[PDB]
């Protein structure tokens, strides 16, 4: 009784400044995108068959800035503070905030030809702690971390880490967007 | 007695501003392009074998702006108001208003090599309500909606939705053009 | 639970005058013939596998007049006003009101040899909007048109259009008859 | 981009009296069950691959009453008023309000052995007007009917009709429940 | 030019008392059920390929009563007066007025698994006097009998005989219903 | 060093009232049955290869009541409060409190023929959080829930949920019993 779902939605709008800014997203249906959030709530557990975050630029070629993405798979790990650290992450990618166009074929459900320049990264579903995760909210996760950070490792599969720097301005310039393209297995319906 | 027609024409000129602007085009011969409009009027019914909208830029690499396209297949659906919503659409594509050059091979009748960066989207002809649609004008559609919006679902196969934002100016800057590349079956001639 | 029915009955008596007279018949069981009307009412839906209207003359060889038949498949189409227009229709046939004898084999359930001269025309069942149509009365159709003509496109499969002109007299001379030879699938019985 | 979903939920609680009581349910995701209602709202269109309504008793063997179910596939059809009429319906089933236990394997996702006595009926998906239906609410349907009933035939695939009579009491006795077991194809996501 | 029709409708409501009550139904389209009566009137002759009467209970398990069915194939035969006699009939079946549930699959157009307990009986179409019978009314039959009973043997294929007894009450208790499930060949249309 | 054990024992006595009563059992050796509780304590960990709960009635056919069973696989899920909710559960079954006899072959170690009517449900061992669970007491579980409910998801594989209602009396009537039929792998002995 597995419902398989493949879909691709907006996950984050992205802006760039001159100082580094590190942010992060939990890789779970609640936080991935507003649509999936609503859909997957109707089931109790899920399993990621595939998760891919893809940056697509919206700015001029002349825009200063770079973007960096990587995954952490231990909720207890501290979020990185530098590109150096972040570069060691599994799935690390990096590029000009005006580059990344060739990643479009990933958010599309179309067959991908040359994606050399694509700023896209996928989750290692195979190396996840386990297979079936429960659907949990941000609130649920925050509560669990507040007791002990390790109680969370079984609730969320992973954490996407994003860093933006190298911008020309101290106030954020609109650079682009991050889209999540997932294939999810949902099971154990709930009312 | 099917007349098959494959052709590619201009469908829309495109301009970009700093506030989001959502527009939409009915995916039917009257509204697709001026040429096809005139041609297909000579038949009573048609079927799309293929429909593809392709954005081609005409602006500098330094032009701010992004463009977003997707299809809606229920005339009753409300037109989206945000990129977030629009990103959930079937056939969604997104890009810089200065990108999209590689989509040229689509509007061309030439064989396409690498189209990774192409801002192009095709209609799901297979998942259309039905096969043979009648040729209808804008007027015809407006009338039918005015009675009940659901009457229209059988008259138009789909709706193309376009969004433009992230521009640097409050008044529109010429960004590019959208071309429709269709293969249509026309039947049941009329005078 | 499909009841298949093949049958052939009188559908229209035909008279000819000197001025053109265009009339039309809905291609649906209620209006096709009095017998089928009564039969098919006992089911809720039907599908035409085959529909053929066949003119058979009853007049002298010396009778002036011609007859013209064609199908329209969009209820919204305006009924034609000239032979020129009507000639463009799908299934168009034309002949002397005293010709058409060789069409007899069609109304007969006998095997047809040479039908070169036959004034007979068949519906394109393949190109119909859809497959299963509901049984509807004239009243039902008139009501639906009165709201919006496009509501009717899903209720009737097609319209037979008949034109008679070239007659020698201002008052109608009996020319012949039109017989409908149909194969219909009836489903979903009703009380 | 089809999401296939198979599932089985409660659809109606059922009570029996001495006078006949005819009720009916639209066979569309909004009205089928509360869970599916919520889930399928997240898409724009659907197609039933399979729909099956299954009565399961909860009363004593000594309980007077019978139950009757059938499908209507034309929204314009008048709801039946007698068992006689209802018995002519496609998919008709009938039984004691205390019988129907053997239908349990249907609501279960288990393999079914002997279901001779099961009070269960399935929709003829093949003979539906068309394939892809839009997700519509009760409100949407009521509106559309209020204009012209025939507008609705394209919005809802069918109507389940239920009749209960032969009870021993003038006030309703709890007899059993009706469960819907569906396999649905959902497409064209929406926010 | 044979129209084949398969269908299943209500044929008789059934009540049980303490004294034996023998009733009977002619096995001809006029008397089989109201729906078929109307349909088949549109043809002149018919042939039964299959006829099956099926009792389905609607009463409590605690209801006293038994039901008995058999066919007579000579209109001149006198209707039986005892179970003993009736038991000799061809196609004889017997059961508790609260049994017979498993016969449901027969009235259904679904595939039948275990029907050991089913109170259902079929006509021996092979051993009928002849093949093509004329459509006749009750009036027609009554007239013909009034002249000589043997005139009727060619008009009606057979007679269903029903007996109900063993009830607990002297006034009839609602027990169940008899449904006819037929496959009929209709020929020689008529107006 | 795996000790495999297959066995079937009493798990719960069951009574029915007029108001709904929802109860639940943890699906772990301590709580499954008194015998297994004692046996499996001698090992440290286990894995369910198969778990099946089976209701067997002990009441008259005339007993009012129904019974409902389903599994929850997230200890944090709130126990259901209505049949409607419970019906959505994975493995859901429902029946008259006097039905369920045909489930006997499951508690038996005999080969099962027709189990259409059986009120029996099995655990989805495949979709369990993980494979090897530790043997834990009720006390152990209560403690762990008292800290944070999510700590428990790794200790207990699942929860059986039972609902009883539709009874004729406000004080419980003995209806039947629930038997657990398990195949367990026990490992890592302990003193």
GROMACS .gro file of C-alpha atoms in nm, chain B residues 28 30 136-145:
model
   12
  219UNK     CA    1  -0.622   2.687  -2.910
  221UNK     CA    2  -0.739   3.112  -3.257
  327UNK     CA    3  -1.365   2.848  -3.119
  328UNK     CA    4  -1.294   3.217  -3.095
  329UNK     CA    5  -1.210   3.422  -2.786
  330UNK     CA    6  -1.561   3.560  -2.806
  331UNK     CA    7  -1.706   3.204  -2.813
  332UNK     CA    8  -1.502   3.114  -2.501
  333UNK     CA    9  -1.585   3.435  -2.313
  334UNK     CA   10  -1.956   3.379  -2.374
  335UNK     CA   11  -1.937   3.018  -2.254
  336UNK     CA   12  -1.747   3.110  -1.935
   0.00000   0.00000   0.00000
